[PDB]
């Protein structure tokens, strides 16, 4: 309903990594780039180890150095669920994509890129024909599923969905 009729809600793994798995699936369909959910967590670990800019330390917090070190361990655990505002921003920067989240609350559209998170308004309308936007749906909390495009899915993938 809050998306065009060629899009559908896919399935994500439910071991705590649904954010990473939803991002991975939309990334692969949109750009062809295959990255495992574990590799996406490792990209966030590496971001935190490599002189991260202040937005990141500000978001997750001397005390800063231990907090970053705790993050580098915790982000590799499936128990740590991913957050579009933090891990999504890191992955948008690495993969040169914009992340569109459909949030239920009515449906609100958020767009995240390497510079942070904004509501999709008149100047930042969601573009469902842009191969550099990836799409996920957030039913509540930090629960995510990929929003995929039938036009870009194999017939077998679509039968597995049905």
Author numbering: 36 to 96, 104 to 147, 154 to 210
Any passages from the paper?
We have predicted and validated a set of OTU deubiquitinases encoded by several classes of pathogenic bacteria. By determining the ubiquitin‐bound structures of two examples, we demonstrate the novel strategies that have evolved to both thread an OTU fold and recognize a ubiquitin substrate. This work establishes the OTU fold as a common tool used by bacteria to manipulate host Ub signaling and provides insight into the origins and adaptations of the OTU fold across eukaryotes, bacteria, and viruses.
Two regions of structure near the S1 substrate recognition site, encompassing 6 and 7 amino acids, respectively, are missing from the electron density. The structure confirms our prediction and mutagenesis of active site residues. Our structure of wMelOTU shows that its sequence topology matches the most typical OTU arrangement seen in OTUB1 and vOTU, and we would predict BurkOTU, RickOTU, and wPipOTU to be similar as well.
